[PDB]
Amino acid sequence: NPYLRLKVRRDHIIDDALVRLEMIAMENPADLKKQLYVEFEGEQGVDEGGVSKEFFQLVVEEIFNPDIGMFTYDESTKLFWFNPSSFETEGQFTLIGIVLGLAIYNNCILDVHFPMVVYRKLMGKKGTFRDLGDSHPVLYQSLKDLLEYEGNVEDDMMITFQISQTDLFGNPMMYDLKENGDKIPITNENRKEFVNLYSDYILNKSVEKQFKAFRRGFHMVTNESPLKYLFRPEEIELLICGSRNLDFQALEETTEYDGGYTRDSVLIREFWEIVHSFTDEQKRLFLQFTTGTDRAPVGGLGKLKMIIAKNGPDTERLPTSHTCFNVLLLPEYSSKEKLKERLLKAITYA
Amino acid sequence: NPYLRLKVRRDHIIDDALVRLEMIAMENPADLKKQLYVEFEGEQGVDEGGVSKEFFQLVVEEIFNPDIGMFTYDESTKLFWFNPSSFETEGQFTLIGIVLGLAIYNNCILDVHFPMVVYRKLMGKKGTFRDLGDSHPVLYQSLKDLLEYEGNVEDDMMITFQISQTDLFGNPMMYDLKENGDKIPITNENRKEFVNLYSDYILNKSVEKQFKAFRRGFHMVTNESPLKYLFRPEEIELLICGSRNLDFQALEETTEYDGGYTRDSVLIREFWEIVHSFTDEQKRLFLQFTTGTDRAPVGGLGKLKMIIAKNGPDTERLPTSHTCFNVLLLPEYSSKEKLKERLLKAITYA
Amino acid sequence: NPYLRLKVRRDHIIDDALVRLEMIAMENPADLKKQLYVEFEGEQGVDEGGVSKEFFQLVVEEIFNPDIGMFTYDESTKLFWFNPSSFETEGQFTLIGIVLGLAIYNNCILDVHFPMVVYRKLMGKKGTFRDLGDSHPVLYQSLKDLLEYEGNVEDDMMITFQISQTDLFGNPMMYDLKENGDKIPITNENRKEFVNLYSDYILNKSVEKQFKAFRRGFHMVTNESPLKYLFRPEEIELLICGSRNLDFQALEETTEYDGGYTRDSVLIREFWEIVHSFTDEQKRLFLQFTTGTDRAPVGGLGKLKMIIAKNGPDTERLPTSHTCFNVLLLPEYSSKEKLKERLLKAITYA
Amino acid sequence: SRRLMKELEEIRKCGMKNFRNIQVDEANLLTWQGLIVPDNPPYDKGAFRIEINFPAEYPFKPPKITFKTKIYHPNIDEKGQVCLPVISAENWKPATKTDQVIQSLIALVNDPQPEHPLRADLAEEYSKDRKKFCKNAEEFTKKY
């Protein structure tokens, strides 16, 4: 039997997905290594990749929404990190896990933003003081200033080996990083130990249960041809997020049209002449707009199979898109100068 | 003892090649792994990689020639696929397989165009319905249309599990995808079953005889440090066909000259000034022309060690090349404007 | 345990390093693949990767310096090769090896130039005649000529299997490449053997002492997750020297400021507007100047976390840098024209 | 949590300038209540109650200030969110004790820094009129 085949229904994606995938694993998990074919219940069609792509976007979208509180978001860095407060969510964590793994096996890049520590932990390496730099910046600056302090630590900051982790309504709970943290005072001679223990709790201890489910899920699809055979974690991020390829030539070819445009067309030729002369940031804006991201799949932008479909005669409306099909909806504007002004305000707006 | 060392004679390359390589396998296969040194019988010289490169170009050219009948070409996509009809050709299929293997090991990229399924099957995967999208477009369009039919099959279509395979003179031979195909009609309920068998047959069962040989050969050299340790098949294509690197700076350095040009020269500097300002499509056409292909070997273009030699004084002739030596023969024209106009009509003509 | 940790003193870096890494190998050798934190004895601070880069640069600077006499440099190719005369230096070769390996695991690229044979030998392959091309250009031409000699060797040339190896004062020492070189003269029928033996010697025997030490070092880090799983040697050079990615956008983001410059600031915006419109050669010049090299780490320029710090009020001085921290000290010039003029003369001068 | 002991218990430490306070809730000392008594500008006699709030992960995280008693100030919003750099990250330091946080804001009151005004409105009315501001504020101070 080719394909995994996930038959789910929008508004119950996460749920039916877990139920389904769970079972498929129970019976020959190998199947979790075949091409993913998605079916929304009650929607005729054939999954040529886009349905599968849609699936990915939706699960990814729901899971990283604060609403379900599985991940906290950091305005400063635009990254997410695990929420230690996430209660009874083993299934959910295992799910994006399985999902991240499938994304790699289906050459489908996801729009996820994790600090590098996440990928290190997936490979089994524990998190560290330096890793906090990107996951908890403010907390890293403090700790670094702790180690860098010239004055008298014990009297100047008097903190102890005990720390605290609060939630939502300001109800701190106390945690002892060492036996009787309460007493043992932090000084210039033990400040390093303290930073190590505090870094450990936070990146490893505090999010164990949820990260472990996450890793278990990732691994249910990653065994055999592991992350091993890969030196650094950046290698895993690249498999999940794509490279920063900007061929565009080649992205031009493999491009198809619908609505009556085709290779030869004033609106089309003017368009390529506009796109090509773009400035990298813009080229990346266009990708981010048309496709759900500014990066490229394995094999370069050519693999994207973008589609430019005519969407009405000249108007004052901005072009649109269906990113899960890399479809660019382009009104047949009356001027190249107007094509570029409208296309721009579109990709720059959002 | 250095080099794989292979000797043959133009006019009989494939044959002489097969026999020797075959022997070499049976006696210490690991030798298929050394640096390939080619020698055409009766031609003094030292193979620095050029003779190796010519060897590759010639074997590849003769195998994909319709005359020999091993692969059919598709004008639409420009890709070759196995020909089910190829009779008594186990040897030859076993040879290119060995060749592709040798190419990876000597960092010499080949001019081969296969639909992705060929590489997936080389990694052990059965080909499936989605794969037909590149290997058999119209077939793929038909079966999609069947699966997507909203009306009622059986009553609207007259097809069964018995399908045809027609020879080059319109003589159809019946093939049953299932026990008594004749009888069992295609319905909306059994069409997915039908589509998967019509796909299995075609991508696997029907080219079985030629594919398994193709693979035995590739594996003879590949046997160890496998394609495993490689998630997708597109990694196999990259090793064989080259990446899309377009450094060119770097291609500049590492470039040597002959005929009295040298780094410092009006025509040379004029040349470089011309090439860099080229448009990616052009830059790729300059590669296609000088080197045998438009791609880059592992290490970037700089690893191509291009050579630019003087081919007479100013003239009306176009520049020429010896692709197996990545040698560019540049007439010392009298004008930068002439250099660019002649060079362009040269790389653009062919 | 995720941390490695090295404490050393400037002015004794190599020895203190060797002693410590050696001890760490003995006790659990896996620790040599972990996250490196360098500490110079008596210097407060934290290593965020820069102290680590400083350590790498300094070890690399002293080891390749002629004074210590471990590597000789070739003015013509800008490549270093092992020195057959380096006496009592096992320790030192072992250390660069280790470092080369440490570099890969902390994704810190180095400014090292080895002929491609060093990487082939690091992968278990003997150095051969084709390899002399890059490591010994002149010697290789001689050997080619000999092989290509159309006349009659022996009668036309006065050479045997006895070759010479001179010291820095013209004191030749004889070496027999085989039993009684003295006697057995070089004929047209035995020259190929002559050439292979003379290549083996030079590329392998000649440097066995110091290359042995070099490999032991590299392998202490490199063992179990081999260069195997890697076809060609250009792959190891990529891991050590970096790829040729020139993102720059991305280089902009992740850039940080000090001295009070911040994202928004007339001097900074003018600066990026200058950088982006640079010509790749310049873009590379800027990297070479700010960081120790013109290439990029796994992950692209973005992982460089470059910092631009205010270095005084407007002046006529040229900007400078602390490559080990990827710091660009930029005086707050009074004008874009001037920013560009001083930046250019700086990155172009050295 | 811990450190809030020595700093706070360090109140009997002479009478500082412009600040009466205590724990509005009385329980887990992570929310302080208080009054800043300005001395010169339009906010001349018409004190303001302030609520300090530092997270359990204090001192590694900076505290946040919120005005309880409404005020007509550029650098403050109606919602009461104060914006003093000394605590707003990218400045915060673990050793800076709350003696500096208050006081620093008192200075931000006694001298608005309309550089990056949390309300461009009163900013312009402040910089291009040190009158049509002091009056329309001291009159908002006197009432609220």
From Swiss-Prot, chains A, B, C:
The keyword Zinc is annotated on this UniProt entry: yes
Subcellular location: Cytoplasm; Nucleus
GO aspect biological process, one term: negative regulation of TORC1 signaling
GO-annotated cellular components: cytosol; glutamatergic synapse; nucleus; postsynaptic cytosol; proteasome complex; synaptic vesicle
Coarse class of the protein's main subcellular location: cytoplasm
PTM statement from Swiss-Prot or TrEMBL: Phosphorylation at Tyr-140 by ABL1 impairs E3 ligase activity and protects p53/TP53 from degradation in (HPV)-infected cells.
Effect of T160I: In AS; uncertain significance
Subunit structure: The active form is probably a homotrimer. Binds UBQLN1 and UBQLN2. Interacts with the 26S proteasome. Interacts with BPY2. Interacts with HIF1AN, MAPK6 and NEURL4; interaction with MAPK6 may be mediated by NEURL4. Interacts with the proteasomal subunit PSMD4. Interacts with ESR1 and WBP2. Interacts with BMAL1. Interacts with ARC.
Miscellaneous information on this protein: A cysteine residue is required for ubiquitin-thioester formation.
Protein name (Swiss-Prot/TrEMBL): Ubiquitin-protein ligase E3A
Portion of the full sequence shown: 520 to 869 of 875
UniProtKB/Swiss-Prot annotation, chain D:
PTM annotation, UniProt: Ubiquitinated. The alteration of UBE2L3 protein levels during the S-phase of the cell cycle is due to ubiquitin-dependent proteasomal degradation. Autoubiquitinated in vitro.
Location(s) in or outside the cell: Nucleus; Cytoplasm
Record-linked CDD domains: UBCc_UBE2L3
Keyword line: Acetylation, ATP-binding, Cytoplasm, Nucleotide-binding, Nucleus, Transcription, Transcription regulation, Transferase, Ubl conjugation, Ubl conjugation pathway
Associated pathway: Protein modification; protein ubiquitination
Record-level Gene Ontology MF annotations: ATP binding; enzyme binding; RNA binding; transcription coactivator activity; ubiquitin conjugating enzyme activity; ubiquitin protein ligase binding; ubiquitin-protein transferase activator activity; ubiquitin-protein transferase activity
SUPFAM superfamilies found in the cross-reference section: UBC-like (SSF54495)
Modified sites of kind N6-acetyllysine: K128
Cellular component terms (Gene Ontology): cytoplasm; cytosol; nucleoplasm; nucleus; ubiquitin ligase complex
Pfam families, per database record: UQ_con
Enzyme's top EC category: transferase
Free-text comment on this protein's domains from its UniProt entry: In contrast to other ubiquitin-conjugating enzymes E2, residues essential for lysine reactivity are absent: Pro and a His residues are present instead of an Asp and an Asp residues in positions 88 and 119, respectively.
Family membership: Belongs to the ubiquitin-conjugating enzyme family.
UniProt name for this protein: Ubiquitin-conjugating enzyme E2 L3
The species this protein was found in: Homo sapiens (Human)
Source species taxonomy: Eukaryota, Metazoa, Chordata, Craniata, Vertebrata
